[PDB]
Each structure stands twice: as structure tokens, then as C-alpha cells.
């Protein structure tokens, strides 16, 4: 018997952006209040967690564009 | 018997951005209040965690563009 | 029997940015208040953790562009 | 002619209070936001004024009792 | 002619208070935000004023009792 | 003609307080933010004023009791 495999995807695409001025942006939060209460935690495996935050962000990229791409190949008898 | 594999993906893409001035950006939080209470923690394996934060960010990149790409190949009898 | 493998991905892509002035950026937080309370911690394996923060950031790169890329190959009888 | 006046009010009253413990009192405001806008002010005579406040109070007297009392007398030809 | 005046008010009153423990009192404001805008001010006579405050108080007297009392007398031909 | 005046008010009153322990009192403000803007001020006569405050107080007297009392007398032809 015989087996042959060719895996040759060709990627030629683009992700692009154009802009003038981003200009006046304001973020003026009047601070709230947070309370959290707990007895025991057991984050045993691959947990991602966040507790009692009160958290502010101003993410303002000039681009902010993104590409994600994944390839796989598997073989058995 | 025989086996042959060729793994030759060709990547030619782009991620790009263009901008004028990013200019006036403001972030003026009036500070809140956070309280968190707990008895025991047991973060046994690969945990990522954050507790009682009260946290402010102004992330302003001129680009901020991103690409992610992953390849794999596996073999058995 | 025989086995042959060729692993030759060709990467030719780009991640790029262009900008004028980034200019006026302000971050003027009115400081909040944080309290956190706990009895025991047991961060046994590969934990990443942060408690009672009250933390401010102004990350302003001229670029900020990123690429991530990973390759693998595996073999057995 | 003749005139005679006697002004002799007799005040014997009381204002009084009795209490146990005043105990658990909480005041935990999540801070709001106030904006006020104006062009000209002309507070010419005996004005009492307050603008753009955002103001918190916890007045907790053990007594807090009050008395007010006023007397007058007037004469003419 | 003749005129006679007697002004002899007799004040014998009391203002009083009694208390146990005043105990647990909390005041934990999550700080708000205030903005005020104006062009001209002209507080010409006996003005009392307050602008753009953001102000916190915990007045906790053991007494806090008050008395106010005023007397007057006037005469003419 | 003749005029006679007697002004003899007799004041015998009291203002009083009694207390146990004043005990646990807390004041933990999460700091707000204040902005005030103006062009001209003209506080010409007997003005009392306060601008752009952001101000915290914990007034805790053991007494705090008060008395105010005023007397007057006037005469003419």
C-alpha cells in the first residue's frame, strides 16, 4: 500500500484601516462602590478569574485590526 | 508500505493601519470604593487571578494591530 | 516499510502602522479606596495572582503592533 | 396722662431625651456625577447660596434637642 | 405726662439628653465627580456662598442640644 | 414730663448632656474629582465664600451643646 498527502494552503489576504483625527474622547466616571463576600476558593485547573474589580479602561488604538489563523494535520495506521 | 507528507502553507497577507493625529484623550475617574472578603484560597494549577482591584488604564497605541498564527503536524504507526 | 515528512511553511506577511502626532493624552484619576480581607492562601502550582491593587497605567506606544506564530511536529512507531 | 407696662413672662419648660445604644449606622454612597453651567452671578444683598455640591452628611447626635424663644416690646407717642 | 416700663422675663427651662454607647458608625462614600462653569461673580453685600464642593461630614456629638433666645426693647417720643 | 425703664431679665436655664462610650466611628471616603471654572470675581462687601472644595470632616465632640442669647435697649426724644 501507499499514502501521499499535500497540505499547501496559499494565503494572500489583508486587513486594513484608514482614519483622520481621532480627536476629543472623554471618560469621566463618578466612582461607584463594590462589595464582595466569600468563604472558600478552589481554582484547581486552568481557571481565569477576577473578583471585586471597580475597573476603568480607555483603549484607543489608531489601528486595532486583527487576524487569527490556525492549521492542523493528523495521521494514523 | 510507504507514507509521504508535504506541509508547505504559503503566507503572504498583511495587517495595516493609517492615522492622522490621535489628539485630545481624557480619563478623569472620580475614585470609587471596593471591599472584598474571603476565608481560604487554593489556586492549585495554572490559575490566573485578580482580587479587589480598583484599577485604571489608558492604552492608546498608534498601531495596535495584531496577527496570531499556529501550525501542527502529528504521526503514528 | 518507509516514512518521509517535509515541513516547509513559507511566511512572507507583515504587520505595520503609520501615524501623525499622538498629541494631548490625559489621565487624572481621583484616587479611590480598596480593602481586601483573607485568612489563608495556597497557590500550589503555576498560579499568577494580584490582590488589593489600586493601580493606574498609561501605555501609549507609537507602534504597539504584534505577531505570534508557533510550529510543531511529532512522531511515533 | 400716664402709661405703665409690665412684661414678665415666666418660662419653666423643658426639652429632654433618653436613649440606649445608637449602634450600627452605615452610609455607603456610590458617588454620582454633577455638572452645572452659568454665565453671570449678582448676589447683591443677604444671599445664602450653594452650587454644584455632590455632598454627604452623617449627623448623629446623642441629644439633638432644640429650643428657640424670642421676646419684643415697642413704644411710641 | 409720665411713662414707666418693666421688662423682667424669668427663664428657668432646661434642654437635656442621656445616652448609652453611640457605637458603630460608618461613612464610606465612593467618590463622585463635580464640574461647575461660570463667567463672572459679583457678591456685593453680606453674601454667604459655596461652589463646586464634593464635601463629606460625620458630625457625631454626644450632646448636640441647643438653645437660642433673644430680647428687645424700643422707645420714642 | 418723665420716663423710667427697668430691664432685668433673669436667666436660670441649663443645656446638658450625658453619654457612655462614643466608640467605633469610621470615615473612609473614596476620593472624588472636582473641577470649577470662572472668569472674574468681585466680592465687594462682607462676603463669605468657598470654591472647588473636595473637603472631609469628622467632628465628634463629647458635648457639642450650645446656647445663644442677645439683649437690646433703644431710646429717642
Numbering used by the authors:
A (entry chain G), B (entry chain E), C (entry chain C), D (entry chain H), E (entry chain F), F (entry chain D): 304 to 380
Text of the article:
Tau amyloid fibrils have previously been established to adopt many distinct conformations across different neurodegenerative conditions. High-resolution structures revealed paired helical filament (PHF) and straight filament (SF) conformations of tau that were identical to those determined from AD cases. The PHFs and SFs are made of two C-shaped protofilaments, each containing a cross-β/β-helix motif. Overall, these results establish that, despite substantial differences in genetic background and age, tau filaments that arise in individuals with DS and neurodegeneration are identical to those in AD.
To overcome the low level of tau filaments obtained from the 36-year-old case, we used a custom-developed graphene oxide (GO) affinity-grid method in which the cryo-EM sample grids were derivatized with anti-tau antibodies to capture and enrich for tau filaments prior to vitrification. For this procedure, single-layer GO was applied to QUANTIFOIL grids, functionalized with a PEG maleimide, and coupled to protein G for binding to the AT8 phospho-tau (S202 and T205) antibody. Conversely, when AT8 was included in the grid preparation, we observed extensive tau filaments in cryo-EM images, although some background contaminants remained. Together, these data indicate our GO-AT8 affinity-grid method successfully enriched for tau filaments in an AT8-dependent manner. Next, cryo-EM datasets were collected for tau filaments isolated from DS cases 2 to 4, with GO-AT8 affinity grids being used for cases 2 and 4. The resulting cryo-EM reconstructions showed all cases contained predominantly AD PHF conformations, while cases 2 and 3 also exhibited substantial SFs, similar to case 1. Notably, structure determination for case 4 remained limited by the low abundance of isolated filaments, resulting in a final resolution of 5 Å for the case 4 PHF. Nonetheless, our structure determined to 5.0-Å resolution was sufficient to establish the AD PHF fold.
